[PDB]
Amino acid sequence: MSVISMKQLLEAGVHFGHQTRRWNPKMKRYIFTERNGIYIIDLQKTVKKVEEAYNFTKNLAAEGGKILFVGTKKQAQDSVKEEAQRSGMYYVNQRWLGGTLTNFETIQKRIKRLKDIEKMQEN
RNA sequence: UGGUUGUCGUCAGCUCGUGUCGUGAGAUGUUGGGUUAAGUCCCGCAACGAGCGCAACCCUUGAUCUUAGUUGCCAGCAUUCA
């Protein structure tokens, strides 16, 4: 089964891309046509690719994989947090701090710090 | 040479851990928008923190309460050259 129907994708506006002047030639594989100066994403391949992504995530999640939802874009900040909270996963919705993954030890110390201040406030 | 001192200069600066960028020396952080006496503080930001500086902690002066009332003080009380 298609994890998402083309009707839902159309209502969600998945077919809307960016302006022709901002197009990436590598994205040509996923573009269906151009209309009114805006590129339209090929929803037929979109359905197939979304189905693969959902299955991959489910396999990875069943192996205990931790998925981090990242979106600082103003339109996405709220959605990322709400959906991550529902799934019990982590999110970065305000600003990605450089070194969050490559310098994980340094971030953990700051994470530890926050928890200490919380305990001082509660106690 | 040790120890000590002058000097830039009581100027607001000088660095480091990890990360990232650069073939490399390096850079970033520490730049930028406001603000400050100040790298002082806020915000932004491939940076995230830390340290020596800055400020504060110390001394003195300016107000006042408590304790203490002599060798200090004399208002109310008499007396003295005081």
The DSSP bridge partners found for residue A70 are: A92
Count other C-beta atoms under 10 Å from residue A87's C-beta: 13
How many other C-beta atoms lie within 10 A of the C-beta of residue A86? 8
Q: Which residue type sits at A82? A: E
Nucleic acid strand B: bases within 7 A of protein CB:
17-20, 44-49
Element (DSSP H or E) covering residue A33? strand A31-35
Q: Do residues A107 and A97 lie in contact, with contact meaning Cβ atoms separated by under 8 Å?
A: yes
Closest by Cα among A46, A79, A54 to A3: A54
Q: What is the DSSP string of A88-114?
A: T-EEE-S-PPTTTTTTHHHHHHHHHHH
A8 touches strand B (CB under 7 A): no
Q: Alpha-carbon distance A47 to A36, whole Å?
A: 24
Q: Please check whether strand B approaches the CB of A111 to within 7 Å.
A: no
Q: Distance (Å, rounded) from C-alpha A119 to C-alpha A92?
A: 23
Question: Whole-number Å distance, CA A55 to C1' B69?
Answer: 94
Q: Are A70 and A95 a contacting pair, CB within 8 Å?
A: no
Q: Which residue has the tokens 């090929």?
A: A42
Q: How far is the CA of A57 from the C1' of B79 (A)?
A: 111
Nearest to A67 by CA among A93, A96, A88: A88
Give 3-state DSSP helix, strand, coil % of chain A, rounded to 5: 55, 15, 30
Q: Classify strands A68-70 and A90-92 as parallel, antiparallel or unpaired.
A: parallel
Give the CA A75 to C1' B34 distance in Å. 28
Residues of A 81-110 whose CB lies less than 7 Å from any atom of strand B: 95-99, 102-103, 105-107, 109-110
* Distance, CA of A106 to C1' of B38, in Å: 29
Q: Going by DSSP bridges, is the β-strand pair A31-35/A38-41 parallel, antiparallel, or unpaired?
A: antiparallel
Question: Residues A46, A54: contact at Cβ < 8 Å?
Answer: no
* Cβ partners under 8 Å of residue A70, min gap 6: A80, A91, A92, A96
A118 CA, B53 C1': Å apart? 31
* Measured torsion, CA atoms of residues A56, A62, A63, A64, in degrees rounded to the nearest 10: 110
